[PDB]
Design a protein around this ligand. Structure first.
Ligand SMILES: Nc1ncnc2c1ncn2[C@@H]1O[C@H](COP(=O)(O)OP(=O)(O)O)[C@@H](O)[C@H]1O
Ligand SMILES: N=C(N)SCc1ccc(Cl)c(Cl)c1
Ligand SMILES: [Mg+2]
Length: 322
């Protein structure tokens, strides 16, 4: 029994894999803070904190400290990390925990040092950082040890990360701040402007999951929220076609990010990718029809990973075990 862990520190969700056990934590990357005196104290982390989004009293806030793929608040991020690490600790396990944390290509030296330090402050004896797209690829079952290039497109909350890998190494990587959050935000903007209804970010995510799609059909759901002009609560019906229209902008931006990456690919790797095509991972890959949109605009085969939300955690878990 071990306390060694591998951590997917996502913009929206954090997952921990524990050596010998598998994925033992999967919670929103959210911290709720309460004002006391002039100080902010940690009130909740993870599942409860996300439920507080859009629902806080004045003396509280709920924050996503990694929301845009950068560390927005080092102290809150460190509190989040230490909370999750402490939550999975097994008193029956060995000490001197080794901790692997997945790092997106664009993370800065300052951010990497901060994550290292948070892990040490949580009781880690050793901290290893591994490249996140390597983790995503391994978790998606890509044979990244082969010479032939593989492309992974990882659509998360706050970012989409594209990488080309070969022989166990990253050859190209690019990050854009378009992903699941931009999709939610487009649905929010759509509801405001077309239906005069103000909706919360959690409701927007629910709409995206239930009726969202990258391609117009159709079916309909009830959407409740705040009236734009007068403020009274009310509800409207929204269809798949409407949701498609809402999501078209961020979908197009994701497709463009994939095109930009492809365009940077040198000849031999382009040949490789022309054969194998593109692997989608991340929760954004669950958007109905996104694979088809990418295929259509690139002319390349597009596959959706098995269990796209868990690919990175599964991948670094594999690395942890070996
Ligand atoms: N069924 C779904 N359809 C579309 N998007 C989804 C679905 N399920 C989850 N998502 C989105 O995936 C994103 C989370 O992806 P994830 O890979 O966990 O991101 P991160 O690693 O950055 O935390 C969120 O924007 C979430 O709303
Ligand atoms: N994992 C993501 N793709 S976004 C959050 C994030 C940002 C910087 C670092 Cl070092 C880390 Cl470890 C994590
Ligand atoms: Mg991720």
């Amino acid at each position: 029994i071990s306390n060694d862990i591998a951590i997917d520190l996502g913009t929206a969700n954090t997952l921990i894999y524990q050596k010998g056990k598998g994925i033992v934590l999967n919670e929103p990357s959210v911290v709720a803070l309460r004002n006391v005196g002039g100080r902010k104290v940690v009130h909740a982390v993870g599942i409860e904190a996300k439920q507080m989004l859009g629902r806080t009293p004045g003396h509280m806030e709920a924050i996503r400290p990694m929301r845009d793929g950068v560390i927005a608040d080092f102290e809150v991020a460190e509190e989040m990390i230490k909370y999750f690490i402490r939550k999975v600790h097994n008193r029956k396990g060995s000490g001197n925990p080794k901790v692997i944390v997945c790092v997106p290509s664009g993370a800065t030296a300052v951010e990497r040092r901060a994550i290292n330090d948070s892990c040490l402050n949580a009781g880690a004896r050793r901290v290893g950082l591994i490249d996140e797209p390597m983790a995503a690829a391994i978790g998606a079952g890509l044979p990244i040890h082969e010479p032939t290039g593989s492309m992974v497109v990882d659509i998360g909350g706050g970012t989409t990360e594209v990488a080309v890998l070969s022989l166990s190494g990253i050859v190209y990587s690019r990050s854009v701040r378009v992903g699941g959050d931009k999709m939610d935000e487009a649905i929010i903007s759509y509801m405001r402007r077309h239906h005069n209804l103000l909706i919360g970010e959690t409701t927007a995510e629910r709409i995206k999951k239930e009726i969202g799609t990258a391609r117009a059909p159709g079916l309909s759901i009830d959407v409740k929220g705040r009236d734009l002009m007068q403020g009274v609560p009310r509800e409207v019906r929204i269809s798949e076609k409407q949701a498609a229209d809402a999501l078209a902008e961020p979908v197009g931006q994701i497709v463009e990010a994939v095109k930009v990456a492809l365009e940077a690919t040198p000849p031999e790797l382009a040949s490789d990718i022309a054969d194998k095509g593109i692997m989608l991972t991340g929760g954004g890959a669950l958007l109905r029809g996104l694979d088809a949109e990418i295929r259509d605009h690139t002319g390349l085969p597009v596959t959706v990973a098995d269990d796209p939300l868990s690919c990175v955690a599964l991948g670094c878990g594999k690395v942890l075990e070996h």
